[PDB]
Amino acid sequence: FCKKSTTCEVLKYNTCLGSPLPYTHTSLILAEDSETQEEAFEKLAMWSGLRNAPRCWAVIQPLLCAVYMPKCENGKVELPSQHLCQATRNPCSIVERERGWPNFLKCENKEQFPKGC
Ligand code: NA
Ligand SMILES: [Zn+2]
């Protein structure tokens, strides 16, 4: 229950929000606001506005990467963990006020954020 079946594509980027990626394949299935790696790129740049709130950023950056450019190997994408999502709710509370969290970034969505892996 910590992986999801999907088709893998070749990464067009070797970096997510400044972090070098140790894998070469991904999928867009977890990011319901993106149908291409180009859209995901754009959406992440938009999210990088939270760099100005380091306490939020330190926890949201690894989350965003796990949702927008997750590792895909052998027809399977790795799901972000519960602890990963939860740690972001308080320090990134401003997101709820400004725009809200979309379905695929709500910690409640157990299908997307299983405990614990
Ligand atoms: Na998508
Ligand atoms: Zn490859």
Swiss-Prot record:
<comment type="similarity">
    <text>Belongs to the G-protein coupled receptor Fz/Smo family.</text>
</comment>
<feature type="disulfide bond">
    <location>
        <begin position="16"/>
        <end position="65"/>
    </location>
</feature>
<feature type="disulfide bond">
    <location>
        <begin position="56"/>
        <end position="92"/>
    </location>
</feature>
<feature type="disulfide bond">
    <location>
        <begin position="8"/>
        <end position="72"/>
    </location>
</feature>
<feature type="binding site">
    <location>
        <position position="33"/>
    </location>
    <ligand>
        <name>cholesterol</name>
    </ligand>
</feature>
<feature type="disulfide bond">
    <location>
        <begin position="2"/>
        <end position="117"/>
    </location>
</feature>
<feature type="disulfide bond">
    <location>
        <begin position="85"/>
        <end position="107"/>
    </location>
</feature>
<protein>
    <recommendedName>
        <fullName>Protein smoothened</fullName>
    </recommendedName>
</protein>
<feature type="topological domain" description="Extracellular">
    <location>
        <begin position="1"/>
        <end position="117"/>
    </location>
</feature>
<comment type="subunit">
    <text>Monomer.</text>
</comment>
<feature type="domain" description="FZ">
    <location>
        <begin position="3"/>
        <end position="117"/>
    </location>
</feature>
<comment type="function">
    <text>G protein-coupled receptor which associates with the patched protein (ptch) to transduce Hedgehog protein signaling. Binding of sonic hedgehog (shh) to its receptor patched prevents inhibition of smoothened (smo) by patched. When active, smo binds to and sequesters protein kinase A catalytic subunit prkaca at the cell membrane, preventing prkaca-mediated phosphorylation of gli transcription factors which releases the gli proteins from prkaca-mediated inhibition and allows for transcriptional activation of Hedgehog signaling pathway target genes.</text>
</comment>
